[model samples]
Target: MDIMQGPSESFVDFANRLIKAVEGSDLPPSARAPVIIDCFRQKSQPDIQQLIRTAPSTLTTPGEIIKYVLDRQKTAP
Candidate 1:
């Protein structure tokens, strides 16, 4: 995925967009998942990088990954 969180975009907004972008791609279903975490690992805001890195490795799909992020977000300060 080529998406990055905009300077003013909220976490949820970016996460949603990221999910849609990856899912919208022509990549095969199996190939589309890794880039969700890959985007977080490689393209997301530095401000949120630390938290994103802490996500468990068990997440195997974009949907689960974004849900995981949003779940943490709801409990965050």
Candidate 2:
């Protein structure tokens, strides 16, 4: 995982970056989603990572996690 979320990066941008890399990689399909989810958790701040872990919805795929994250982000004040 060579991904590095920029210091000033917003969650949307960082998530996009991760997906781009995931899409660009030659990793197998089965490995791709978990890798994306893994990066999402690892790349986030310590406290925020906990939020994803305990999110109300089941996060079993990259799509689910990204959707959950974006929904929360856009809905927040």
Candidate 3:
């Protein structure tokens, strides 16, 4: 799908966005869903999820959701 991703200042933005969405959404904390959904719902940018899921395998890293998002922003646009 078509989207405007980003050139990120820092991954902190990604993490904060994630925490905020999880705090607000219908999601329960224990489920451990993706932080990208947090960015998606809050920023109205669900396309980031698509970017994250489809981004290069090397971009993937455990417990590093912010890096993943920033990596996506770097490549996606």
TM-score top scorer:
2
In model 1, pairs of residues that clash are: none
Q: How many pairs of residues collide in each model?
A: 0, 0, 0
Q: Which lDDT tens digits does candidate 3 get at residues 1-77? A: 22223455244555555556466777765643554444443443445556655556554333554566655567644
- State the number of backbone clashes in model 2: 0
Candidate 2 per-residue lDDT over residues 8-77, each given as its tens digit: 7777777788888888989888998888787778887654577787888778796787687677667656
Kindly provide the TM-score of model 1 when superposed on the true structure, using C-alpha atoms. Answer: 0.62
How well does each candidate superpose onto the true structure, as a TM-score?
0.62, 0.70, 0.36
Q: List the candidate 3 regions with Cα displacement exceeding 4 Å.
A: 1-5, 35-77
lDDT of 3 at 23: 66
Candidate 1 wrongly placed segments (more than 4 Å): 16-25, 75-77
Candidate 1 weakest lDDT stretch, 10 residues: 57-66
The stretch of ten residues in a row with the least summed lDDT in candidate 2 is 44-53
Better of 2 and 3 by lDDT: 2
Which lDDT tens digits does candidate 1 get at residues 1-77? 35778887887788778778877878777776787777777778876676667766676666776676676678756
In model 2, which runs have C-alpha deviations exceeding 4 angstroms? 74-77
Can you give the lDDT of residue 48 in candidate 2?
A: 52
> How far out, in Å, is residue 55 in model 1?
2.4
